[PDB]
Amino acid sequence: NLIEVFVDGQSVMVEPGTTVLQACEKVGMQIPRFCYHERLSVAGNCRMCLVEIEKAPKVVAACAMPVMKGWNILTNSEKSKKAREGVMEFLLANHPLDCPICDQGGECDLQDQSMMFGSDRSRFLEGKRAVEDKNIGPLVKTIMTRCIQCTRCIRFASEIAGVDDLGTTGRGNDMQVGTYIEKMFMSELSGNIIDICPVGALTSKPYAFTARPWETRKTESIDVMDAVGS
Amino acid sequence: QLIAVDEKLDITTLTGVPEEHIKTRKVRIFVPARNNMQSGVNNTKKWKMEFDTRERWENPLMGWSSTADPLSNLVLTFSTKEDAVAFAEKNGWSFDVEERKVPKPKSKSYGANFSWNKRTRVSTK
Amino acid sequence: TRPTIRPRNDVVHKQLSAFGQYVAEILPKYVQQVQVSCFNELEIFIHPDGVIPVLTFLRDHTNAQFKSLADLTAVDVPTRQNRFEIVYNLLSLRFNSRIRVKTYTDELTPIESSVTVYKAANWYEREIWDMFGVFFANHPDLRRILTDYGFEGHPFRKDFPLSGYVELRYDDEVKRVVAEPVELAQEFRKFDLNSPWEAFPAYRQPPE
Amino acid sequence: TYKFVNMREPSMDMKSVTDRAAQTLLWTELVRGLGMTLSYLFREPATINYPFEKGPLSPRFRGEHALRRYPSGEERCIACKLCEAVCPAQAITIEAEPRADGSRRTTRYDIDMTKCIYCGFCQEACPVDAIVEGPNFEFSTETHEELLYNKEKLLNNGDKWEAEIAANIQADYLYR
Amino acid sequence: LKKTTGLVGLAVCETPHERLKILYTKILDVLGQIPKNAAYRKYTEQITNEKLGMVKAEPDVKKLEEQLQGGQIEEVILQAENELSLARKMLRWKPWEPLVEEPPANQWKWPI
Amino acid sequence: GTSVKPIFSRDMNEAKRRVRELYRAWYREVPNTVHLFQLDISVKQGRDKVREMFMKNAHVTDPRVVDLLVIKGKMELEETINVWKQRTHIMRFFHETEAPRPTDFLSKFYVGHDP
Amino acid sequence: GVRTSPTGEKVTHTGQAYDDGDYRRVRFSDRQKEVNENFAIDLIAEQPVSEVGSRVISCDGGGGALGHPRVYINLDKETKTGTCGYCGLQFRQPHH
Amino acid sequence: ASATRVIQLLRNWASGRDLQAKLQLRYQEISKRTQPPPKLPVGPSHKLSNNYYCTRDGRREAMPPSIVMSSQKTEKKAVTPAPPIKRWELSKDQPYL
Ligand code: SF4
C-alpha cells in the first residue's frame, strides 16, 4: 500500500520507491533541477535539487533519494536555500557572460533558477574556463563554453535515440561533452537535445539570432509532416 | 420582493463590442502548454482564454506588421474551466474548450541504471 | 540589522487588528471578513448591501471618525462570479489612520450610491460607472465623465481591448471628424514575460 | 508645528489709524508695486541671444538617438533586444539574422521618434553601449516620415556625433 | 470666551457643558432602544458614559478639552451630534442581526 | 442567484413601459436635434435611425438588461438635448464615411480572409 | 563598400534594395536614399588578427567599463582563429 | 553684474533692498562644468563572506495578510484605530505672520 510522507508538515500518500522530488511535486512544489528529466534516467550530478529532511543532518538529492515512511521534507529550509545558493554560485562562477549574445536568452533555466534560488552577487575573483566548440551537424550549434556538464544530451542520445556517439571526455574541471572526433550527431530525433539542454550550449542553428522568447506568440497546432500527428 | 430571471445570462448588448467581433469570433479556453525550452511548470497553472488569429500585413512604409483585429492581443486568465466557460457564454463569443493535460506519474529508480539482467543498465554516467 | 528589508510595526499591526475585531463585532450583519496586511493596512470585506450603513458607521462613530473619502475605485476580475470589486479608502484624521472597505458586484446588480455619506463619491462613482459599467442606484447625476461623448463600452474592463474598436480622423468629404474601425500601422506587440519558475513559496496555492 | 498666515489684527491707536487712512487715500502700496516694477526695469535681463548663445546642458542630457561603433569600426549592437524589451513606448523594432561572417547583427533597427518618450531606458539596458541618446536636440522636421528613423539613419547619427557622444560617456560613465 | 475656533464654519459655543450633557443624555436615551446584547450598544454606552463623566467633573473648558482629547469643545459637540444621528440610523438599520448572506466560494481569493 | 436584485421595473411589462417612454422622448427630440445641430439629414431620417437603434436590441428578454439599456439611452438623450455632443457624434451614428462592407460569401472570399 | 543595384539604387549593409518593378522606389524621387557608407563587416575584416601565447584569452572590447562584457576565448583549434563575438575580434596562438 | 552706480542706487531706492547682495544672474559663482572624477561608495551587501541572500531577501519576508475575522471560520473596552492625534504646538520660530 501507499506510505505516508510529509512535505513541510503536510501529509502526502505516496507509493514506495517514490523520490523526494516526486513527493514534493505531488504536494505541489517543483524542486529546482538541472540534470533531472522525467523522461530520462536519474543522474543526480548537478546537485541543485538538494533538500533537507527534518532530522537528517545531511541534505539528500531529491531527484534520486526514495522516500521513507515518516519523512518530513523541508523544501524551503535554511539548509536547502544555502545548498541551492552554493550550487548556483559554482555554476555561474564557471559560466561565461554570454546572455545578450545567447539564443537561450530569456528562456534559460540557469537564468531563471539563478533569479529564483541563487544569490545576486559574485565572489569569483579568478579567470573563467573556455572550452573549444564542437561541430555535430547543420542542425545543432554548439557553444560548449556554456555547458554545465548536466549530461542530459548524452542520456537522451543513448536511451531515446539509440545512438551512443555522445559522452564526456577527460575528468575534473576539464571534462568536456562531445564526440571526441569530428562526427556529426545526425538522427531523426536530434532537436530534442536542443530542447532539453538547460543552457545555451546546444541551440537551434536555423533559429539562431532571429528572435527572443518574449516576442514569440505561441499557437498550439499539430504536425502534418508524417502520420503520427505530433 | 426579489425578481427571478429563468433565462441564460447575456450582456452582449451592454459590452459594446461590434456585432462582427461578437458573432464571428471563436475563443480558445485551455491551459497553456509548458514552454518546452524550460523545465518550470509555473506557467501551466491557470486557464487562458484567447481569440482566433486574424490577418496581419506588411506596412508599406517602414515594413512594420499592421493589423485590423482589436482582440488580437486580448488574453484573459481564469482559475477554472467552468469560470472561463461561463464568461465566454455570457459575453456571447463562440468557444472551444481543451482539457488540461497533466503528466502521468512515472516510476523513477536510480538503481535501475545498474540492473544485473535488464536493458535499463546505462553504458555511461 | 538588515538594511535592505523594510522594518515591521507590531504596535500598528496590533492596533489595526483590534479595531478590525471591534468593527466586526459591532456590525455582524454585513462584515464578511477582516484582514490586516503585513505592511499595516486594514481591510474589511462586507456584503454589497451594507455599503451605506458601514460607511455611515465608519464616518460618524466616535471611535471611527473616517471623515475623508481618500479614494473609490473598482477592480475587474473576470474569473469571479461577481467580477467587479468596489474599493473604498477612508482616512481618519482624529485617530491618524486609514481603512479600506471592499464590496463585490456584477454587471447587472446596482450598488447603493454613497453620495449621502461623502460628496466625493459623486465623481468617483461617475468614473466607476464610466470605466466599468457598474450602476449606482441613487446617484444625483450619473453619466460618463472621462470617455468621449457617445463612447460605447467600458474601457477599464479586462475584456476591453487596449486600443478599443474605433478611431477618429478628419474626413474632408464630410468636413467633420469621423469615427472609423481601429486599424494600426504597427500592431501592439504582446510580450510573455512571466518566468515559469515559482518566485514566492509563501504564496503557493494547493494544487486541487 | 504650524503657523498662522493671516491672523494679525491692526492697532487702533490714532497714529496707526491715520497711517492706514493715508495709505487708503494716498496709494502707498500701489507706489511700492510701481517701484518694484521700475527696479526690475533697470535690472539686466536674463534673455540669451539664441541661436548665437545656447542654454547650458549636462553630459547626462537625452537628445537624438544614435548607434555607436567600436574603435575598429564594427557595430556595437549584438541584437539582444534588451532595449526593445525595456522600451516603455514600444518605439523600437529589431530584426536580426546571422551575418555573412556569423556575427549576431541586426538587419532592421527602427526607432519611431514620434512614439519615443526620450526616457533613456534603452541606453541603460544596453550591455555594450551601442544605442545612446546623444546631445543633439535641434532635429525638427517638416514631414512626419522623417521622424521614423531606421538603422541607416541611427548609424549616420552615431558617425556624425561620435566625438561628442564619446566625450560625454567618458565624462559620465563613472556615475553609471 | 475665545474669539474663534480656527475652523471655518465652526461657531464658538458659549455653553459647552450644557450642550454636551444634553447631547450625551439624548444619545444614552436612543441607545436604550437597541437590544442589550448588541455590541454597538455596549461600546457606545461605555464611551458615552466615559465622556459624560468628564464633563460633569471638570468645570474648566481647556482642561476638559485636554481630558477628552477630541479637539476643541466645538468639535466634541459636533462629534456628539454625529454620534446621535448615527445611533438613530443604527436603530433603524439593526446591524446586530446575523450575516445577510455568505459570499460565493471564491470571492476574496487572491491571487486568482 | 435565483432571487436576482432588480434594478427597477420588476417584470418585463414595466421594462417595456420604460422602453416606450424613452422612445417617445427620443421621437419628440429629433426635430430639435436637426434644427440646433444644423444637420443636413431629414427629420424622417433621424426618426428612422432612432427606430433602428431601438430595434437592434429587440431580442433582449432580461428586465435588468432592458433597464440598463434604457438608462444608457436616457444618458445619450441628455447628451443630445444639452448640446454636449456636436454634429460629429450625431453623424457618427450614421457611419457616413464607411465603404459598404460586403456580406456575401463570394465577395468576402474575393476581398480577403475575413470570415 | 557601397554597391549599386541594376536599377541604380545603392544597397545597404543588409542587402536591401527594391526590385525594378517595385512601386516603392517612387519615395526616393526628388530626394535621396539614406545609406551608411561604412560597412562594419568590411571594417572588421580590415582589422588584423592578434597573436597571444596562451590557450585562453580574455576580450572586453577595450576601455574597461566602456567595452562589452568580458568573455574568454579558447585558442586550441589551430585551423581557425578564436573570435570574440561581442566585438568580432580574432585571436590566435603562434603556430610554427 | 555690470551696471553703473547711479542705476544701482536707483534700483536700491525703488526696491528697498541691496540688490547686489542677492542677484538673480549667475557670474562665475557656480561650479565649473568640468569636475574631477568620482568614486562612488560600493554598498552594504558587497561582502565576500557571511553574506547569503537567504538572510537578506526582502521579498521572501512578505506574508499573506493575516485573517483577523472570517465568518466562514467580561466586558471588553472599546478601542480606536490608533491613539488620538495630539494637538499640534504653535511654532516658536514665527507663530504669526
Ligand atoms: S545559457 Fe543562460 S546563463 Fe548562459 S549565457 Fe545563455 S542565457 Fe546566459
Ligand code: SF4
Ligand atoms: S550540452 Fe547541454 S544537455 Fe549536454 S551536458 Fe551540457 S548543459 Fe547538459
Ligand code: SF4
Ligand atoms: S528613450 Fe525610452 S521611450 Fe525612447 S526609445 Fe529609449 S527606451 Fe524607448
Ligand code: SF4
Ligand atoms: S540593448 Fe543594445 S545590444 Fe541589445 S539590441 Fe538594443 S542596441 Fe542592440
Ligand code: FES
Ligand atoms: S536535479 Fe538532482 S542532482 Fe540534479
Ligand SMILES: [Mg+2]
Ligand atoms: Mg537549449
Ligand SMILES: [Zn+2]
Ligand atoms: Zn571583444
